[PDB]
């Protein structure tokens, strides 16, 4: 269906230990493809995906030049922020950055994202209309006023629509084997007594891609979200994902419950009963 490509940048200062640490990773949907690390001896963008290893060195040299430009941008961004907020240099502070684009099923542009976060909170970000900036505090309004006057919103908009999309288009071709596939989950239930009057029902979803999924419990067709424990979706490590939800039930009322799974790779959603 629709597809997404994102780059995630994380910079962290380490005051006594010298230069900040910069870590950036590429993603297409939930599949990672490249990475870059400040402390890595390679000092080059490295492929984390097998279908992107085929790219020529002209490509790698170009990408690794831009990611280094961003790394030092964020290192100075950190210095500006410690000045802006007047935090002492003894403290270690974090700047996260994300940008990317989305496309439709046919491949036309959908949305775009250019944003930063300082110490886990939103600092600045680009509005969906891609002509404006959202700036939380009065420190970000300075950078906003800086980036409005420098016409930054227009240049990234040209990138996001022109360059971000066209790369995503070739990647979705290059990786047609892996990327464009959809793996239906393999599901089942497990039953785990605790007391003699209670038992635990767990509904599993295994080996599915993409990771977006909806797990649900019900009783007699009515929704049980009261007693539900539901874990965060976890990567399997092979490229697929896993998740489960669970409810504690009075024994023996068990088949009075149903589990409901929805995923892109499923033609119809599933219903599991004990």
């Amino acid at each position: 269906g629709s597809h997404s490509m994102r780059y995630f940048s994380t910079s962290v200062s380490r005051p006594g230990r010298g230069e900040p640490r910069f870590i950036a990773v590429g993603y297409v949907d939930d599949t990672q493809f490249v990475r870059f690390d400040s402390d890595a001896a390679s000092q080059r963008m490295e492929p984390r995906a097998p279908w992107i290893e085929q790219e020529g060195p002209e490509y790698w040299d170009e990408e690794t030049g831009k990611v280094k430009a961003h790394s030092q941008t964020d290192r100075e961004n950190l210095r500006i922020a410690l000045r802006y907020y007047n935090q002492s240099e003894a403290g270690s502070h974090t700047l996260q950055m994300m940008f990317g684009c989305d496309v439709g099923s046919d491949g036309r542009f959908l949305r775009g994202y250019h944003q930063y976060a300082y110490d886990g909170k939103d600092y600045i970000a680009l509005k969906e209309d891609l002509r404006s900036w959202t700036a939380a505090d009065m420190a970000a309004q300075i950078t906003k006023r800086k980036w409005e006057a420098a016409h930054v919103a227009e240049q990234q908009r040209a990138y996001l629509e022109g360059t971000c999309v066209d790369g995503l288009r070739r990647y979705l071709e290059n990786g047609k084997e892996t990327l464009q596939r959809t793996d239906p989950p393999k599901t089942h239930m497990t039953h785990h007594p605790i007391s003699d009057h209670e038992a635990t029902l767990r509904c599993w979803a295994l080996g599915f891609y993409p990771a977006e999924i909806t797990l649900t419990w019900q009783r007699d067709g009515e929704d049980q979200t009261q007693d539900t424990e539901l874990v965060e979706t976890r990567p399997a490590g092979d490229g697929t994902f896993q998740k489960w939800a669970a409810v504690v039930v009075p024994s023996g009322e068990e088949q009075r419950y149903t589990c409901h799974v929805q995923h892109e790779g499923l033609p119809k959603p599933l219903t599991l009963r004990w």
Partner: peptide, 11 residues
């Protein structure tokens, strides 16, 4: 394909 701002802009 990574972002490149022609003149790199900081806060």
């Amino acid at each position: 394909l990574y972002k490149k701002l022609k003149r790199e802009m900081t806060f």
